[PDB]
Write an enzyme that holds these catalytic residues in place. Sequence first.
Site, PDB file in Angstrom:
ATOM      1  N   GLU A 128     -49.267  15.733   5.659  1.00 41.28           N
ATOM      2  CA  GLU A 128     -49.600  16.104   4.293  1.00 41.28           C
ATOM      3  C   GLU A 128     -48.365  16.605   3.554  1.00 41.28           C
ATOM      4  O   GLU A 128     -47.376  17.023   4.157  1.00 41.28           O
ATOM      5  CB  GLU A 128     -50.690  17.172   4.290  1.00 41.28           C
TER       6      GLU A 128
ATOM      7  N   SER B 125     -46.149  48.316  -7.200  1.00 43.10           N
ATOM      8  CA  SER B 125     -45.753  46.940  -7.450  1.00 43.10           C
ATOM      9  C   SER B 125     -44.381  46.889  -8.110  1.00 43.10           C
ATOM     10  O   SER B 125     -43.880  47.882  -8.639  1.00 43.10           O
ATOM     11  CB  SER B 125     -46.783  46.235  -8.334  1.00 43.10           C
TER      12      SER B 125
ATOM     13  N   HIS C 280     -50.441  49.148  -1.535  1.00 40.85           N
ATOM     14  CA  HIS C 280     -50.997  50.231  -2.339  1.00 40.85           C
ATOM     15  C   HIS C 280     -50.120  51.475  -2.313  1.00 40.85           C
ATOM     16  O   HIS C 280     -50.102  52.235  -3.285  1.00 40.85           O
ATOM     17  CB  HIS C 280     -52.400  50.577  -1.850  1.00 40.85           C
TER      18      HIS C 280
ATOM     19  N   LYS D 270     -56.049  38.921 -17.765  1.00 41.25           N
ATOM     20  CA  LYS D 270     -55.063  37.942 -17.317  1.00 41.25           C
ATOM     21  C   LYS D 270     -55.513  37.259 -16.035  1.00 41.25           C
ATOM     22  O   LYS D 270     -55.245  36.070 -15.834  1.00 41.25           O
ATOM     23  CB  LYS D 270     -53.704  38.603 -17.114  1.00 41.25           C
ATOM     24  N   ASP D 271     -56.198  37.990 -15.155  1.00 42.17           N
ATOM     25  CA  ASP D 271     -56.767  37.364 -13.967  1.00 42.17           C
ATOM     26  C   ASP D 271     -57.808  36.321 -14.346  1.00 42.17           C
ATOM     27  O   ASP D 271     -57.859  35.241 -13.749  1.00 42.17           O
ATOM     28  CB  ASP D 271     -57.379  38.426 -13.054  1.00 42.17           C
TER      29      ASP D 271
HETATM   30  C1  HEM Z   1     -53.380  34.272   1.973  1.00 45.80           C
HETATM   31  C2  HEM Z   1     -52.185  34.857   1.855  1.00 45.80           C
HETATM   32  C3  HEM Z   1     -51.841  35.919   0.778  1.00 45.80           C
HETATM   33  C4  HEM Z   1     -52.638  36.590  -0.071  1.00 45.80           C
HETATM   34  C5  HEM Z   1     -54.173  36.521  -0.229  1.00 45.80           C
HETATM   35  C6  HEM Z   1     -51.801  37.457  -0.867  1.00 45.80           C
HETATM   36  C7  HEM Z   1     -52.234  38.317  -1.849  1.00 45.80           C
HETATM   37  C8  HEM Z   1     -51.454  39.211  -2.544  1.00 45.80           C
HETATM   38  C9  HEM Z   1     -51.895  40.089  -3.609  1.00 45.80           C
HETATM   39  C10 HEM Z   1     -53.321  40.200  -4.189  1.00 45.80           C
HETATM   40  C11 HEM Z   1     -50.844  40.789  -4.019  1.00 45.80           C
HETATM   41  C12 HEM Z   1     -50.849  41.846  -5.142  1.00 45.80           C
HETATM   42  C13 HEM Z   1     -50.777  41.133  -6.486  1.00 45.80           C
HETATM   43  C14 HEM Z   1     -49.410  40.552  -6.718  1.00 45.80           C
HETATM   44  O1  HEM Z   1     -48.402  41.247  -6.451  1.00 45.80           O
HETATM   45  O2  HEM Z   1     -49.325  39.387  -7.174  1.00 45.80           O
HETATM   46  C15 HEM Z   1     -49.700  40.391  -3.232  1.00 45.80           C
HETATM   47  C16 HEM Z   1     -48.433  40.897  -3.356  1.00 45.80           C
HETATM   48  C17 HEM Z   1     -47.356  40.563  -2.583  1.00 45.80           C
HETATM   49  N1  HEM Z   1     -47.340  39.592  -1.611  1.00 45.80           N
HETATM   50 FE1  HEM Z   1     -48.899  38.425  -1.064  1.00 45.80          FE
HETATM   51  N2  HEM Z   1     -50.493  37.289  -0.473  1.00 45.80           N
HETATM   52  C18 HEM Z   1     -50.481  36.348   0.531  1.00 45.80           C
HETATM   53  C19 HEM Z   1     -49.361  35.899   1.190  1.00 45.80           C
HETATM   54  C20 HEM Z   1     -48.087  36.409   1.076  1.00 45.80           C
HETATM   55  C21 HEM Z   1     -46.879  35.857   1.658  1.00 45.80           C
HETATM   56  C22 HEM Z   1     -46.857  34.566   2.508  1.00 45.80           C
HETATM   57  C23 HEM Z   1     -45.847  36.641   1.296  1.00 45.80           C
HETATM   58  C24 HEM Z   1     -44.332  36.557   1.625  1.00 45.80           C
HETATM   59  C25 HEM Z   1     -43.788  35.707   2.500  1.00 45.80           C
HETATM   60  C26 HEM Z   1     -46.388  37.711   0.491  1.00 45.80           C
HETATM   61  C27 HEM Z   1     -45.655  38.732  -0.066  1.00 45.80           C
HETATM   62  C28 HEM Z   1     -46.074  39.568  -1.070  1.00 45.80           C
HETATM   63  C29 HEM Z   1     -45.276  40.568  -1.737  1.00 45.80           C
HETATM   64  C30 HEM Z   1     -43.798  40.871  -1.426  1.00 45.80           C
HETATM   65  C31 HEM Z   1     -46.050  41.167  -2.641  1.00 45.80           C
HETATM   66  C32 HEM Z   1     -45.641  42.296  -3.601  1.00 45.80           C
HETATM   67  C33 HEM Z   1     -44.928  41.661  -4.779  1.00 45.80           C
HETATM   68  C34 HEM Z   1     -44.299  42.737  -5.602  1.00 45.80           C
HETATM   69  O3  HEM Z   1     -45.043  43.603  -6.119  1.00 45.80           O
HETATM   70  O4  HEM Z   1     -43.053  42.724  -5.721  1.00 45.80           O
HETATM   71  N3  HEM Z   1     -47.749  37.538   0.368  1.00 45.80           N
HETATM   72  N4  HEM Z   1     -50.105  39.422  -2.342  1.00 45.80           N
END
Ligand code: HEM
Lengths: 52, 49, 105, 60, 378
Positions: free
Chosen positions: E270, E204, E200, E226-227
């Site tokens: 798996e 993004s 936040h 879109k969601d």
């Molecule tokens: C259960 C696991 C996870 C959940 C629920 C989750 C959820 C989210 C959500 C809601 C966002 C904001 C929407 C979006 O940018 O698409 C986000 C952004 C992001 N997530 Fe995850 N995420 C998870 C795991 C991960 C993992 C494993 C990584 C990296 C190894 C990661 C890295 C990022 C990054 C870098 C962003 C920002 C992307 C950008 O704006 O450039 N997240 N995540």
Amino acid sequence: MLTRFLGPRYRQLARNWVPTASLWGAVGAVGLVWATDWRLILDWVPYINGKF
Amino acid sequence: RIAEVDARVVREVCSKYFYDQCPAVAGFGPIEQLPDYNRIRSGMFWLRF
Amino acid sequence: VSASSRWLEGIRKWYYNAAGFNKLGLMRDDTIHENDDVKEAIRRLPENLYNDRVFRIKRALDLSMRQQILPKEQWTKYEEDKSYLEPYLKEVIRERKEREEWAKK
Amino acid sequence: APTLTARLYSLLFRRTSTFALTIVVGALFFERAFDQGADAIYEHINEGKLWKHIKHKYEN
Amino acid sequence: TNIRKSHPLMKIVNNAFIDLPAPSNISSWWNFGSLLGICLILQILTGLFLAMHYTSDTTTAFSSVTHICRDVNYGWIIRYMHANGASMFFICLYMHVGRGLYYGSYTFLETWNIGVILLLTVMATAFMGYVLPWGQMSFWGATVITNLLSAIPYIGTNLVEWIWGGFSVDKATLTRFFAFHFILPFIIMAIAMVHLLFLHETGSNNPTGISSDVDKIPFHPYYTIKDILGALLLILALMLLVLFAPDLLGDPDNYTPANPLNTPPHIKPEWYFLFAYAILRSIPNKLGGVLALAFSILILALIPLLHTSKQRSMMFRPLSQCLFWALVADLLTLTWIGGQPVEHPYITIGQLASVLYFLLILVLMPTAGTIENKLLKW
Ligand code: HEM
Ligand code: HEM
Ligand SMILES: Cc1c(-c2ccc(Cc3ccc(OC(F)(F)F)cc3)cc2)[nH]c2cc(Cl)ccc2c1=O
């Protein structure tokens, strides 16, 4: 002791807002009947009655 | 003409000309906070009504 | 003229055309990753160059939104792409390294 | 007003309470219609295989 | 004036979801992060309805699951939804990670590291879930992962015995695995709140890699719809798997009750762990194999340190793009190899693929970045 709300303006507002409240109540009733599958009411509806 | 207006007439005329209508918007200056057109359009009705 | 310089010019022109940022009408310095040094360098720009940079970036983002590109006659030419952010970033890096050198002592 | 969509807008879709009422009534009828259609298609594709098709043979 | 912007509780939701400024050009790859939000909740729902009929006793676990399939009203739907939701979750997770890697989202170090933690936690939860049916593959996967800690010198046997709660895999192991599987998703959700919180502050990213403060739009109604569309497509794919191919991604061998004596001759995990199973099989050394397995997953933490390019995203970097797709093809190669028996020529192919994987991540990407820096004259 909400005696502040006894005047011409509030009865006028209530008269204006009664139809929408009645429609929302009807929406709630129909939604409840459709969700519960309440046969007591639905057996009288003509086309629905054939599903039982 | 003026004496013949009452609350009912005002409600009907306003509902005719304002409610759920597409407006035209013009902004000049620091207007970064002006809402998007979809938000302005969605503000032209109520879900309660 | 040097043959090695000729090959370098050819390879650089090829890579410039292949990178593709020119298709959106951007310049090279528009695409730089912004960190503290680059932020200060951009903060030091004059009015007209700053406004031009803002408009070019905005147009590029709109083209990216719509999944389009400019017509081929509006693409940035490789030869006319002259860096505008060189001296500012150079001076900022120079000052930072002077500060670090003082801090070492 | 002659157009169907104009009548639908001027009659139902203006208010939101009427919009919701229309939605629930449409769902109520569409449930039965879709169920009957899908069951008819499924029964026709697999005729002579379901239990109800061979039920009469065994039960007296 | 407006209660939405001043109420203590609705203000958080307003600042998080309704009035959030977002870039105007983020493509469909940004939807997967929202989809991971959906799938998690789905697994919390369906699983919560499987816990009302599951018993963790070793003598009445397989039978309880078959009771769920056969006797509970619509229980087969809930069971196979929970079963295939894991595959959907891991597909979305790998797409999320690939999106972050391609477009340079790893410069947000805090969010990236919290995501790495979330990845490890979800992997643990998925593994612990697969043991509860108590079939053949359950037994011989629990055994192997528990013995995986035996390679640590001087404490390995004691840790293995402590995790087992005994001299082998038995009732205590199944009960504690059930408890951990129940509890860990709540911790995952709690950590995901922090994953969102750290994002936040910085905003993004967008595909161009350039800061997009000039072009912003509200999150609602543009990315809510879109969601909804992405959720609809996800539900379509999940229900296709559930209703037209319930056992495509499964294994037949887990439909036999667990046998402590026999072992199937074609054991495999798996589909979403096979690449690790390809790496561990490559090295003929126990400690070396375990260290390679750990490092193949923990190398994502070192990705921000290896960045050497002036441009954030690979949109304008052709050599980096070629290397990225070579990496993806290599991961597919490892996933193919992990499902095959250890024999000629698959041993050589697996070893070469693992070497190529590590070399691509560590050596070639920074070199390409430096070369591209020299080509652009800066
Ligand atoms: C259960 C696991 C996870 C959940 C629920 C989750 C959820 C989210 C959500 C809601 C966002 C904001 C929407 C979006 O940018 O698409 C986000 C952004 C992001 N997530 Fe995850 N995420 C998870 C795991 C991960 C993992 C494993 C990584 C990296 C190894 C990661 C890295 C990022 C990054 C870098 C962003 C920002 C992307 C950008 O704006 O450039 N997240 N995540
Ligand atoms: C991120 C969340 C979760 C994931 C990824 C997950 C994953 C899995 C997986 C892969 C299985 C194996 C199913 C099979 O092979 O048949 C499983 C089984 C199971 N899970 Fe979960 N699970 C999650 C959350 C939960 C929660 C919150 C509960 C209970 C509160 C739960 C209860 C169960 C039960 C009882 C089983 C065994 C019953 C069966 O075989 O269907 N799960 N889970
Ligand atoms: C290497 C290997 C695996 C395997 C198991 C798990 C992973 C991924 C993983 C890694 C760590 C983890 O725990 C943690 F997250 F750290 F808490 C949870 C999951 C990768 C591979 N699973 C097999 C399952 C059978 Cl049945 C047989 C043999 C193998 C086999 O040789």
